[PDB]
Amino acid sequence: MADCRAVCSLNTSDRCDFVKRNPDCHSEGGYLDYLKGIFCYFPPNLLPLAITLYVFWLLYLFLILGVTAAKFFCPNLSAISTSLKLSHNVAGVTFLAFGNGAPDIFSALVAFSDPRTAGLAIGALFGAGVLVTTVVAGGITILRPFMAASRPFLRDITFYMVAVFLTFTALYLGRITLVWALGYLGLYVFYVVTVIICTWVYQRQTTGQILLQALNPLDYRKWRTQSISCKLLKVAKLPVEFLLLLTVPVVDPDKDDRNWKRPLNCLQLVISPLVLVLTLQSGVYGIYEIGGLLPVWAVVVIVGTALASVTFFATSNSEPPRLHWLFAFLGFLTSALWINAAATEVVNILRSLGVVFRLSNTVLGLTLLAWGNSIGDAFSDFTLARQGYPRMAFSACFGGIIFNILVGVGLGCLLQIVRSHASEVKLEPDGLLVWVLASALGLSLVFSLVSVPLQCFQLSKAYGLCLLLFYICFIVVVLLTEFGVIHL
Amino acid sequence: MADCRAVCSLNTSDRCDFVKRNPDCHSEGGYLDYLKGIFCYFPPNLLPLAITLYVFWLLYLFLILGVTAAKFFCPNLSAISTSLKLSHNVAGVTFLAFGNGAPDIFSALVAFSDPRTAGLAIGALFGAGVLVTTVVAGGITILRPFMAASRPFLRDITFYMVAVFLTFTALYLGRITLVWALGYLGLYVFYVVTVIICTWVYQRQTTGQILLQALNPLDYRKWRTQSISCKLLKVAKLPVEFLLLLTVPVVDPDKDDRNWKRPLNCLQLVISPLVLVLTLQSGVYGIYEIGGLLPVWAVVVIVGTALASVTFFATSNSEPPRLHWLFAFLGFLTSALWINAAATEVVNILRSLGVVFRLSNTVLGLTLLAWGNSIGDAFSDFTLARQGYPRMAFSACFGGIIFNILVGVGLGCLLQIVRSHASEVKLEPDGLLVWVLASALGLSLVFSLVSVPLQCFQLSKAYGLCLLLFYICFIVVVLLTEFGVIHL
Amino acid sequence: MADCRAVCSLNTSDRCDFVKRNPDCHSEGGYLDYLKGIFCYFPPNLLPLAITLYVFWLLYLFLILGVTAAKFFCPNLSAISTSLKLSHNVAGVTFLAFGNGAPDIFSALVAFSDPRTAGLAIGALFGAGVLVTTVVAGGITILRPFMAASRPFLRDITFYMVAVFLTFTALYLGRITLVWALGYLGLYVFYVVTVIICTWVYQRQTTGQILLQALNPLDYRKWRTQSISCKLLKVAKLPVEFLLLLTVPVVDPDKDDRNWKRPLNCLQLVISPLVLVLTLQSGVYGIYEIGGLLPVWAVVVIVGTALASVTFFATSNSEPPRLHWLFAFLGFLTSALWINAAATEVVNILRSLGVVFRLSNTVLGLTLLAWGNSIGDAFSDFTLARQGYPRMAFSACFGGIIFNILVGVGLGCLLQIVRSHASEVKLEPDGLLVWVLASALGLSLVFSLVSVPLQCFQLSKAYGLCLLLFYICFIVVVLLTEFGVIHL
Ligand SMILES: [Ca+2]
Ligand SMILES: [Ca+2]
Ligand SMILES: [Ca+2]
């Protein structure tokens, strides 16, 4: 049963057979098989084109992960929370971190669920932490210089150093047990409670018309105002948001009618359970059949139509019903499942590349997965800075990575422990590159901890340019370590 | 034939004979043979006198370079740009590129001629590219902050990355074929056409006393009211100033009289072609005879005398002729040669000393040759920035080295293919340093591409200081690679 | 008869015995035996605690070294020099350097005096040179931008480069001879004379109550005024300052009363010689029994109490004696020995750490010893720059390291050569790291030499941030070299 990275050590006429025979080149989840497409569908001379296509597909996957997280996931989370009298400023402080970190969390959950991929998770978390700490944070200060707040900055930097060293030592021990995962989650809860307490202490001291209007993702008057590049971005994003509108119900506590799109919501009482059934566990639970007569999706459709008609004729178009808030929960489920789905695909693609090019999980994680997971950070935070809120963006840039690392490691490892019934997740370090990654994260934190106070919390262009050059040097060292040029 | 360092070890009786008969020691560039003058003309006991005289001569050469750049070269470039209404980007990409890039092209042509030193020619071009994109560009932004033009900068940086990656791939294949050389030249012609077209679209959318006064480098009014130090500097500067006034014409647009000296310019109309001939290849075409009856220098003298008489009789003192600005072109040529000439002897001095102090060919190859080729870039660009044209100099730093790489590689390999009657040029990477140079060039281009837009094209001293630190780190990696601390 | 470094390969039940028997674990000075404490007086399970303790002890010693140097050594030096009426320009130039560099000088003296520790000296004198040039100098520009003076800067940078190249070539040759050490000291004298001449040419062109008060290290008004952190630092420094007030006399020419605390100084006529005889050579000369009846300390006490009684009964309260300045000499001498004593302990601790973890002398010297020796630099220079004198701080930052390296190497090696009656001091190589350190010092000097003129001597935040990032990269390369990731 040869390790199926040996596939390039074979004659091209045997490749497909190897892929079909070796269970090590089969995945546990997803819909497409990418090694099979590499070696069977495409002809051997057309290898580069295929891989080029794959990168494009991978990039498009990130786009989905961004949109779903920002327009459909966090709004419904906010609706659920604000149905329970929550505050305003910490809402902006922390929900920005949640929306920026959802892709990171779901990617870590997917990667930790398989020993062949767990390395990706670590590389993708630490890697993102480096990027956001240098390129995004520095970038903010180049776009608008501002004055940071001393106490929040020092609080965040301390908590994040603590989390980095906890993961550093868990990596040295080579494993992470149930108590460690529970400790990570508890430490995150402690951090949020501290934020709340300290803020308090600082302060004291026809219907078819609305179907069409509800399924239209364009605003033409705004669309003509934009530039050529933004128009191209919008036409790229059109199909994704059309599907998300079709399947995910959204509730805004802001708008007066709360997005009560009566007929679209009545249809989504049918559509959303189907996408949920066909998405959970890649649909394995879907073709499940009660008594060998009818599958799951049939009874789902029957009950869905019943409830959809019942609600359709029982409510008024201008007036939402009394159980309207429940839709947010539904919209929180289906959206999350969409994110999970896309995350699965991303991870599968990365695994495939590692087989074809014999690249480690750590390099793939800290480059491709990190950059893809941080695209949303860049959009959100640069846009927020250019609008006149660089202080909020800088706070998110250091308070969202804490969420990433703590919740990602804790929850991913906890779910793996529960599912596998084992007693720990094994973190085998992947050679010498993992220590380079950890050292780089520590050193970027040390640079910020010394520099920001010494400027008296007055951040400007020079700080950002220096952080950019730090990232360039870090990539130099990563490249050298991966080519075998530095060894021991 | 022994290595040229060993001449320090031989007996003093026949050191001069060894320097004479060994081809590997005698210089191939300039007008003076310094090794001969240090081992033959001077007694074996007066060597420190030779060393101190050589150092003083080197300092005087730097003075000559400074005066020529400040007084004769940059004024004529400005006159050309003003007369043709060229924008600073176009002026820095077309005219400044050729004058700055002549040494690079000629060195590449020579180096590609030998089948052994083909891959050593690629290293000089990459090294000079790294030096110019970091040190000269950063120095421009430190000495004089300015705002770059966004559209030309993006165009230039994109073309330069394309050319650099194309040379990466040609080096990786290990081969330059005739089709590749023609593709390089075609890409350069395409780039120049694009520059011109885009600029056009944007646009649419008695007499003896004056000979004696004109050839006079002294000003008595200033002379009387100076300090002793400045007086000594002026008297040290006089001979080169006089020769430069004699040989280089200067057109001035800021002057109402236009800086038109009728008899001096008419004489220059035969002096300047003569020096052009005598210092292109040190007069090889000058000594050659056409038809075996009238030699070349006689021909140029005859034609220049005829043209000078025509101009002298067609013009009055007070009003310059209608084609006055063309003198700037002549003044742009000769002065450029004065720079190239001088830079050569600077190099040919250091090399000489390197033999006496016993320095091997380890670092003198790929790093001394880039600095020697970039002396003119530094002088011209820094002078031009300090005079109020940092956009022109910055544009050269990213648009003239496109000329360097494309024309150097394409023309050198095309000439080799033609002469050798072969079909290919073998590029043989020698070790690990060529890939370090390639990676450094690519990474500095990436740094500038991210940084300049993120500053919104307003460049200041922080960007330049980061670029100097980058070059320091590049030298660190180069030294670690040369001593073998970085290996496989 | 193995080396002490083997102690950590024996069985845990024999370690202690080894340290008793092995002569190589015995230090030739000091008062405590740190190896005999880490193996014989502690349980093997709590070895980490001991090391943490040791580090804290180390840190406290550095505190001592600062206080004695700033508050007791330099004041008495000034009181001696004022007998020849020196002005305040010479003061701010050089006395700041003496007070800042005393710990460095005494550490080098202690380290050179033993072939087993002579590496620390080199590592510490170069390492501090790097740190003070990047972190302190850079920091001064971030806290307060200023315009540097050009002539002093060029003079200092030149002299420091010459000193660094001299030490680099002595390290390459592998030994320091008598004439080399005398050349170092003569070159320092030459530099100081040049500073004086250049500044000149520029200038042309009841009783019990006052015992209890004299021994009061607090000014409780200011203590009530200060913040929390300053209060904590003062309560940390209280015992050292109390002991220093008890033992070291002080003469202050600035005050009117001239620091003539009649009864305290008369009592210090007894206290001081006893401290001298007990800290000289760690007390070897103290027990030497003269004539088989009297130890040295006994006759010292008797003669001292005779002089003290005579002086007290022959002196006046508010009028100091005629020979008052003589006290200054005493106060200087005793204070020197305090520094010496503390320095010895530091060196011993570092040696022990090297034995335990098998760390080189160079790495311990360039990290721990250099940081501890530069703490006083940081305090003095940052405080001076925040009060509005950043030119003085910046000048001290480049003229104190010249004193430091020249006097340290010259005087430490000269004393060792005199004592051992040898002809030289060997500079044994600690492998590749020493060349990494020397190259880093040279490269930081080059960065400053190019950058500061290019800014036209107007120094700002960006320069300092780049120097900080340089130091981060340097410590990265050091850390890679120590673990053998880069080797040859
Ligand atoms: Ca993210
Ligand atoms: Ca050039
Ligand atoms: Ca010091």
> Which CATH superfamily includes the segment(s) C42-260+320-482?
NCX, central ion-binding region (1.20.1420.30)
Give the other-Cβ count within 10 Å of B145's Cβ: 15
Instruction: Classify domain A49-205+334-482 by CATH number.
Output: 1.20.1420.30
Which CATH number is associated with domain B50-205+320-482?
1.20.1420.30
The answer to whether the CB atoms of B470 and A472 lie below 8 A apart is yes
Interface contact flag, A455 C483, Cβ < 8 Å: no
Kindly provide the b/e burial profile for residues C217-239, where b requires at least 16 CB atoms within 10 angstroms of the residue's own CB: eeeeeeeeeeeeeeeeebeebee
Assign 3-class secondary structure to chain A. Answer: CCCCCHHHHCCCCCHHHHHHHCHHHCCCCCCCCHHHHHHHHCCHHHHHHHHHHHHHHHHHHHHHHHHHHHHHHHHHHHHHHHCCCCCCHHHHHHHHHHHHHHHHHHHHHHHCCCCCCHHHHHHHHHHHHHHHHHHHHHHHHHHCCEECCHHHHHHHHHHHHHHHHHHHHHHHHCEEEHHHHHHHHHHHHHHHHHHHHHHHHHHHCCHHHHHHHHCCCCCHHHHHHCCHHHHHHHHHHHHHHHHHHHHCCCCCCCCCCCCCCHHHHHHHHHHHHHHHHHHHHHHCCCCCEECCCEEHHHHHHHHHHHHHHHHHHCCECCECCCCCCHHHHHHHHHHHHHHHHHHHHHHHHHHHHHHHHCCCHHHHHHHHHHHHHHHHHHHHHHHHHHCCCHHHHHHHHHHHHHHHHHHHHHHHHHHHHHHHCCCEEECCCCCCHHHHHHHHHHHHHHHHHHHHHHCCCEECHHHHHHHHHHHHHHHHHHHHHHCCCCCC
Listed residue (B354, B376, B381, B377) closest to B365, CA to CA: B354
Asked how this structure was determined, the answer is: cryo-EM
The neighbouring-strand residues paired with B458 are B147
Question: Which of C371, C460, C466, C476 is most worth mutating to test chain A (most A CB atoms within 10 A of its CB)?
Answer: C476
**What ligand is nearest to the CA atom of residue C369?**
3
Kindly tell me the sign of the dihedral angle through the C-alpha atoms of A179, A182, A184, A187. Answer: negative
Distance C401 CA to ligand 3 centre (A): 8
Say whether C147 sits in a helix, a strand or coil: strand
Instruction: Tell if the CB–CB gap between C446 and B472 is shorter than 8 Å.
Output: yes
Nearest chain C Cα distance for residue B35, angstroms: 27
Calculate the alpha carbon distances from C93 to C33, C137, C392 in Å.
40, 16, 7
- Which residues of A lie closer than 8 Å to C, measured between beta carbons? 432, 439, 443, 446-447, 450-451, 454-456, 460-463, 465-466, 469-470, 473, 477, 486-488
* Token pair recorded at residue C59: 């840190």
User: Dmax of chain B from CA atoms?
Assistant: 77
CB contact under 8 A, C461 and A470: no
How many helices, marked H, and strands, marked E, lie in chain B?
A: 21, 6
Say if the Cβ atoms of B472 and C439 lie within 8 Å: no
Question: B459: part of which helix (H) or strand (E)?
Answer: strand B458-459
Provide the residues around ligand 1 (an ion) whose CB is within 5 A: A 100, 104, 373, 377
Question: What's the Cα-to-Cα distance from C37 to each of C13, C19, C117, C434, rounded to whole Å?
Answer: 15, 10, 20, 31
Contact by Cβ (8 Å): A367, A127: yes
Instruction: Give residue C304's identity as a one-letter amino acid code.
Output: G
Q: In sequence order, what DSSP letters do the residues of B393-451 get, joined into one string?
A: HHHHHHHHHHHHHHHHHHHHHHHHHHHH--SEEE----SSHHHHHHHHHHHHHHHHHHH
CB B448 within 8 A of CB A450: no
At residue C295, the 3 state secondary structure works out as: strand
Q: Do B469 and A469 touch (CB under 8 A)?
A: yes
Q: How far is the CA of C133 from the centre of ligand 3 (A)?
A: 12
Chain C positions in Cβ-Cβ contact with residue A477 (cut-off 8 Å): 476
| Alpha-carbon distance values, C460 to A144, A336, B135, B465, C152 (Å) | 19, 49, 19, 11, 19
Using CA atoms of C435, C436, C442, C446 in order, give the dihedral in degrees to the nearest 10.
150
Closest C-alpha among B33, B24, B34 to residue B2: B24
Q: Are C365 and C122 in contact (CB under 8 A)?
A: yes
Question: CA nearest A331: which of A74, A97, A63, A66?
Answer: A74
Best of B386, B461, B470, B482 to mutate (most C CBs within 10 Å, chain C): B461
A-chain residues near C479 (CB < 8 A): 439
| CA–CA distances in Å: residue C228 to residues A467, B65, C225, C234, C235 | 33, 62, 10, 10, 11
Token pair recorded at residue B180: 């590749």
Q: Is B40 within 8 Å of B25 (Cβ atoms)?
A: no
Task: Return the biggest CA–CA distance within chain C.
Answer: 76
The Cα A150–Cα A153 span in angstroms is 5
Nearest to A112 by CA among A408, A447, A442: A408
Q: What subunits touch chain B, counting only 3 or more CB pairs under 8 A? A: A, C
Using only the alpha carbons of chain C, give its radius of gyration: 24
Distance CA C399, CA C92 (A): 11
Please give, rounded to a whole number of angstroms, the shortest distance from the CA of A177 to a CA of chain C: 25
Q: What ligand has the least distance to the C-alpha of B380?
A: 2
Domain map (residue ranges) of chain B: 1-45, 50-205+320-482
Residues near ion ligand 2 (CB < 5 Å) are B 100, 373, 377
Buried b (16+ CB within 10 A) or exposed e, C87-106: eeeeebbbbbbbbbbbbbbb
Residue to mutate among A147, A434, A437, A454, with most C CBs inside 10 A, is A454
Q: Rounded distance, CA A366 to CA A290, Å? A: 45
Residues in chain C within 8 Å Cβ distance of B461: 455, 460, 462
Check: CB of residue A247 under 8 Å from CB of residue A334. Answer: yes
One-letter amino acid of C283: G
Q: What does the alpha-carbon distance between residue C363 and residue C354 come to, in Å, rounded to a whole number?
A: 9
Distance from CA of A82 to the nearest CA of B (A): 37
CA of A98 to the centre of ligand 1 (A): 9
Who among B465, B475, B486 is closest to C451 (CB)? Answer: B465
Residue of B383, B303, B321 whose CA lies nearest to B96: B383
The CA distance from B143 to B378, in Å, is 13
User: What are all long-range contacts of B80-89, with beta carbons under 8 Å and residues at least 24 apart?
Assistant: B80/B325, B80/B328, B80/B329, B80/B332, B81/B392, B82/B253, B83/B253, B83/B325, B83/B328, B87/B199, B88/B389, B88/B391, B88/B392, B88/B395, B89/B149, B89/B152, B89/B156, B89/B199, B89/B391, B89/B392, B89/B395, B89/B399
The length of chain B is: 488
Pairwise CB contact (< 8 Å): A450 & C473? no
Rg, C-alpha atoms of chain B: 24
Paired with C424 in beta bridges are C177
